[PDB]
Amino acid sequence: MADESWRVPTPVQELAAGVVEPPTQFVLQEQDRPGSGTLLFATDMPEPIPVVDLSRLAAADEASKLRSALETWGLFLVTKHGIEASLMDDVMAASRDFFYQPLEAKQEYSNLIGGKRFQMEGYGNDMVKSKDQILDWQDRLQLRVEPQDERNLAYWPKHPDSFRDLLEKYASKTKIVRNKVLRAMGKTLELGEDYFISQIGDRASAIARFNYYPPCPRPDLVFGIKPHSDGGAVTILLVDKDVGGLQVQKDGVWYTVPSMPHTLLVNLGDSMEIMNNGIFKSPVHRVVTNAEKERLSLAMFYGVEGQRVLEPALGLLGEERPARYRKIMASDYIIGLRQGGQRFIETLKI
Numbered sequence: 001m002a003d004e005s006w007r008v009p010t011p012v013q014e015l016a017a018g019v020v021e022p023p024t025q026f027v028l029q030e031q032d033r034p035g036s037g038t039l040l041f042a043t044d045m046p047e048p049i050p051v052v053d054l055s056r057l058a059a060a061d062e063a064s065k066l067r068s069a070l071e072t073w074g075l076f077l078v079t080k081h082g083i084e085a086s087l088m089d090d091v092m093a094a095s096r097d098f099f100y101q102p103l104e105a106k107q108e109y110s111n112l113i114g115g116k117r118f119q120m121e122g123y124g125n126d127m128v129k130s131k132d133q134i135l136d137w138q139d140r141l142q143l144r145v146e147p148q149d150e151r152n153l154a155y156w157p158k159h160p161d162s163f164r165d166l167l168e169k170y171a172s173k174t175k176i177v178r179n180k181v182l183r184a185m186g187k188t189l190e191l192g193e194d195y196f197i198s199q200i201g202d203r204a205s206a207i208a209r210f211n212y213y214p215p216c217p218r219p220d221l222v223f224g225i226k227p228h229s230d231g232g233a234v235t236i237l238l239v240d241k242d243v244g245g246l247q248v249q250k251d252g253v254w255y256t257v258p259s260m261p262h263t264l265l266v267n268l269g270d271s272m273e274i275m276n277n278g279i280f281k282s283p284v285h286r287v288v289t290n291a292e293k294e295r296l297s298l299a300m301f302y303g304v305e306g307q308r309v310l311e312p313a314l315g316l317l318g319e320e321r322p323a324r325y326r327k328i329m330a331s332d333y334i335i336g337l338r339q340g341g342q343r344f345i346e347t348l349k350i
């Protein structure tokens with residue numbers, strides 16, 4: 001009937017080889033470009049830089065840093081998070097080893113069912129919904145890590161042969177970090193330390209996303225990953241070798257997210273914004289490319305169980321305090337998120 005072979009994009013790592021212009025499907029309209037047309041993409045983030053010593057989170061001055069960071073930016077760097085540098089280095093080395101393999105080897109894990117049907121899990125790109133869609137300058141391998149009995153290990157790279165063990169160990173380590181952050185948030189919001197852990201639920205999704213950003217000859221014309229907020233409750237992000245690129249939006253201004261060696265980045269998701277009545281909000285963020293080197297990151301997305309109603313916590317609505325978000329089942333929120341200027345969560349504000 002009709003040819004829709006534009007739904008099947010070639011990996012950017014291939015398209016980026018040796019080019020001096022970005023192919024047209026990556027080029028943003030002038031007013032949408034990182035510097036809107038200029039070479040100045042972002043402002044340096046002002047002090048105090050949002051940094052949280054996770055081992056000292058029970059101390060009041062550290063809790064005050066976490067609260068200040070979440071109010072101001074919706075994210076923070078974490079130090080002393082309990083994840084050994086050797087394991088952070090190895091999981092990102094395993095990722096680099098996978099992306100460096102031949103296209104043939106990587107497409108054995110393709111997220112294009114039968115070579116044509118997008119699904120989220122596997123190696124490739126995000127869904128192409130229309131011919132005129134501007135694509136991001138990245139590829140990604142995305143894997144469902146939790147619940148354990150829902151994993152499809154056929155999409156997990158078999159080479160290098162320690163990829164699976166490294167990801168499993170790392171994910172179990174980021175779950176500890178997740179819970180420590182969530183307990184500190186329940187405490188500062190006076191909701192109980194286990195409030196958000198229980199809202200999220202024992203079988204909640206945890207998804208690993210290994211991002212690969214090839215060098216781009218014209219970083220002013222494309223996004224490595226387009227402006228967005230994460231949809232779940234909390235994201236724990238690891239950037240290999242702290243290569244720059246990540247930026248965060250605040251009051252319409254884009255700020256470079258600074259790096260610290262051996263740290264992780266925690267950012268809130270939209271589901272958390274609703275659950276906490278907007279006290280802390282989900283930050284809009286993006287990745288700009290560079291001309292010199294590839295950039296690798298690993299995001300651990302912690303979602304909320306699908307049938308949980310997302311709604312402002314009851315403890316935040318005492319004393320006739322008004323709800324600022326309509327309620328919505330978590331699976332319904334994700335569905336609305338994947339629909340096509342205005343972010344979906346704006347439709348829920350009251």
Ligand SMILES: O=C(O)CCC(=O)C(=O)O
Binds near residue numbers: 211225239287296
């Ligand atoms: O690569 C990064 O630093 C950001 C990744 C990100 O925003 C995402 O995968 O949702």
Ligand SMILES: [Co+2]
Binds near residue numbers: 228229285
């Ligand atoms: Co993100």
